[PDB]
Known about the structure:
The complex is a heterodimer of chains A (52) and B (101). Chain A is mostly helical. Chain A has one domain (1-52): Helix Hairpins. Chain A is 17% helix and 0% strand. Chain A starts with 19 loop residues before the first helix and ends in a 24-residue tail after the last helix. Chain B has one domain: TAZ domain (CREB-binding Protein, Chain A), CATH 1.20.1020. Helices cover 55% and strands 0% of the residues of chain B. Chain B is globular and about 40 Å long. Chain A binds chain B through residues 9-18, 20-22, 24-28, 30-31, 33, 36-43, 45-46, 48-52, and chain B through 5-13, 15-16, 18-19, 21-22, 24-25, 27-29, 32, 43-46, 49, 54, 57, 64, 70, 72-73, 76-84, 89, 92, 95-96, 98, 101. The complex binds zinc ion (3 copies). One zinc ion binds at residues 56, 60, 66, 68, 71 of chain B. Chain A: It comes from Homo sapiens (Human).
Amino acid sequence: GSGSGSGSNVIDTDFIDEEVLMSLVIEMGLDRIKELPELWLGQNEFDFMTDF
Amino acid sequence: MGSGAHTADPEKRKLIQQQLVLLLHAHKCQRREQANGEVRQCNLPHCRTMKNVLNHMTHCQSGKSCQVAHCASSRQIISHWKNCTRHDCPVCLPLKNAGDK
Ligand SMILES: [Zn+2]
Ligand SMILES: [Zn+2]
Ligand SMILES: [Zn+2]
């Protein structure tokens, strides 16, 4: 017996390819960022990211 | 240090998706080195910051209570992306599709 409820940042990107998002990074400009903005519970339509 | 932005802006949600990508890449990008014992040169140097976060998240014992740089965000963000499923969620779903563009 070896139960488990949560691991460590499983995320749904373990199937994704680092090459795919790569092209998307250059397309948007994720590899040319000078100032990384802050990410804190801002909007109200995305409050689902609480996880509290 | 400076304070005055704990709730961030609404555009952050937009940056969340984009950031997730930097945190998404940085994720598999940070595990590709520790899982092989060695490290390799990365294309986009932006993943560096995340590498310091994902690594900090390991030293981050509060996670959702931490406020180190992006810690709470990297934890809060990856959190959504982790618990999020179905519904009108254009974050993990589309990023999981990758059908076109
Ligand atoms: Zn990288
Ligand atoms: Zn921390
Ligand atoms: Zn989601």
